[PDB]
Design a protein around this ligand. Sequence first.
Ligand SMILES: *[C@@H]1O[C@H](CO)[C@@H](O[C@@H]2O[C@H](CO)[C@@H](O[C@@H]3O[C@H](CO)[C@@H](O)[C@H](O)[C@@H]3O)[C@H](O)[C@H]2NC(C)=O)[C@H](O)[C@H]1NC(C)=O
Ligand SMILES: *[C@@H]1O[C@H](CO)[C@@H](O)[C@H](O)[C@H]1NC(C)=O
Lengths: 176, 277
Amino acid sequence: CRAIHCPRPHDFENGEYWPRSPYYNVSDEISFHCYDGYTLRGSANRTCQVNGRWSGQTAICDNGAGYCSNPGIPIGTRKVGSQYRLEDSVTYHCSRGLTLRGSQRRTCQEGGSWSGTEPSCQDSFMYDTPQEVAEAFLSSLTETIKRKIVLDPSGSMNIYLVLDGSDSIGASNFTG
Amino acid sequence: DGDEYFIGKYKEKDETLFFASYGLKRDPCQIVLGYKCSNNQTHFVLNFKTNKKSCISAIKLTSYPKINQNSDLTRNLYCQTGGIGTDNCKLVFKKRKRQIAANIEIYGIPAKKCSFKDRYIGADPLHVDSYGLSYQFDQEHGWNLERNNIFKDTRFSTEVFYHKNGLFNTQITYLAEEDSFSEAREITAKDIKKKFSIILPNEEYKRISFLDVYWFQETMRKKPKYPYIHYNGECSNENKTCELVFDTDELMTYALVKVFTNPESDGSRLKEEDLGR
Ligand SMILES: *[C@@H]1O[C@H](CO)[C@@H](O[C@@H]2O[C@H](CO)[C@@H](O[C@@H]3O[C@H](CO)[C@@H](O)[C@H](O)[C@@H]3O)[C@H](O)[C@H]2NC(C)=O)[C@H](O)[C@H]1NC(C)=O
Ligand SMILES: *[C@@H]1O[C@H](CO)[C@@H](O)[C@H](O)[C@H]1NC(C)=O
């Protein structure tokens, strides 16, 4: 068993980041900074911890001359497409030894928002801790105001739970 | 088709200040002509400040697609710092879940000699008010009723405050059949203070019998704070020049008073259930 290596950025358009190295150890820092006449959104200082993911959000430098905004390049992927008007599409894919999790193609809808979710490809050894799982489940299931569920008048919900009992655990009779 | 919201009244001899189209799901906006906005899940605000010497006249907003809700019982457009007559105000609009576009236009007129009396006074002041709805009385007492199909509000008992197209209203007293129209008076933005007054004549056959005020203003939140328009002292027969005094909690930008005259008025006229504390 060897050390944990955080992924190395692949592309960055209209900007520059410090420093550069073939691979980044644990608790190393990267700082982004981009050209004149643009605007930076996100986090400027990013560091990777023991989990294997960079801490913060994605850094996006934008100009402000399109119907729908810049999607940005998630760290580790590669983007194809450079048209930011109505009815165009953008595709993502990342490097070798990584498996994608999210949307493959995104389309600029009528309102001004994209259709899908921002991809960020993972590897074998990254797990999810209970805190983030609970937070994401609660945030997706309900809406904020505290947090209450919204229904239309004369509305209803139908929950369907599907388990499997194949030879994967074999623990008594569905215990746990 | 799409729904529409108005502020002010339009005239056929006005030039456009600007004209733009906005999406209502992007984050952030697209900065158009170096202006500022803000967009949230339930709010869309815009900042405007012109450079040329002009006074604004009307604002209009159009939204798509059509939704099943009337657009006169509540407030959806209002600007928070300024208004009509002042060269800038900060527009605020409240969205829904199904609105995804907006078109905005602003009209104005040259600053020096701009006055709005020629529009809101109408062509038949004795039969139609500024709103457009005609008067209608009671045949057994000759007192006008209360129009009911507009957004109306009360502070305490025995008070009324109407609203329509960004224009408020307040009727001082009750109106009789045989009243006459004398004149109208307007107050511009350079003579507006936190507290002020106005002088009117009551000489012989110019007896004041009815006063109704129209004014624009600003609102910090969706719940407004109506100003106190009380009637200084008592305007009986003896005191010929009668004053009207305002007491505002927020700054207005325009006012208009339509004096009515009736020689038969004795100075007191009140309903049989309005009278006791
Ligand atoms: C989305 O943005 C809108 C404005 O674009 C937010 O509405 C505004 O929020 C501010 C911040 O809370 C309010 O200002 C606050 O007013 C109090 C009143 O006493 C005063 O102490 C401060 O000035 C304070 O900042 C503002 O009233 C409010 N409404 C406006 C500007 O019309 C809205 O809250 C945002 N959405 C969310 C979910 O926060
Ligand atoms: C009525 O007359 C009195 C006489 O002193 C005067 O003080 C008051 O201002 C007058 N009121 C009006 C409304 O003219």
